[PDB]
Amino acid sequence: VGYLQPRTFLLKYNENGTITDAVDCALDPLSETKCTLKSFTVEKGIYQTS
Amino acid sequence: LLHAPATVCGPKKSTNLVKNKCVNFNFNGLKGTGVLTESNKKFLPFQQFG
Ligand SMILES: *[C@@H]1O[C@H](CO)[C@@H](O)[C@H](O)[C@H]1NC(C)=O
After folding, report:
1. B44 vs A: CB within 8 A
2. Which of A16, A20, A11 is nearest to B45 (CA)?
3. Distance CA B8, CA B18 (A)
4. Fewer CB atoms < 10 Å away: N or C end of chain B?
5. In this structure, are residues B8 and B1 in contact, taking their beta carbons and an 8 Å threshold?
């Protein structure tokens, strides 16, 4: 048994229409950079995130 | 007219399909303007719009 609270997930959709991956936007700061760039892969650099 | 989404309604009248024409489509609460054509994109059975 688990709970649900209001938070943001970045979820991508396959070319067949199904969901293959999602990102918790508040788990660790790398995932927050993934959410602010709206991409699953980030490059090397500085990202002013939050 | 109780404070709930109602479950008893009337049958909403329909229309035959038209291809390649600027029409005012209404697909279950989708008011707008566009043309209608066939598509090769495959859906999943629980989808209805895109
Ligand atoms: C997408 O659906 C088609 C239809 O059969 C299938 O051939 C293809 O392998 C599917 N691709 C993925 C990534 O699920």
Report:
1. yes
2. A16
3. 30
4. N
5. no
Method: cryo-EM
Amino acid at B26: N
Give the rounded distance of the alpha carbon of B38 from its chain centre: 15
Q: Which of A16, A18, A19, A20 has the most ligand 1 atoms within 8 A of CB, as the residue to mutate? A: A16
Do residues A9 and A23 touch, judged by C-beta distance below 8 A?
yes
Q: CA dihedral defined by B25, A15, A7, B29, rounded to 10 degrees?
A: 10
Please tell me the distance between residue A19's alpha carbon and the centre of ligand 1 in angstroms: 13
| Alpha carbons B42 and B15: distance in angstroms, whole number | 24
d(CA B41, CA A33): 32
Question: Quick one: resolution in A?
Answer: 3.0
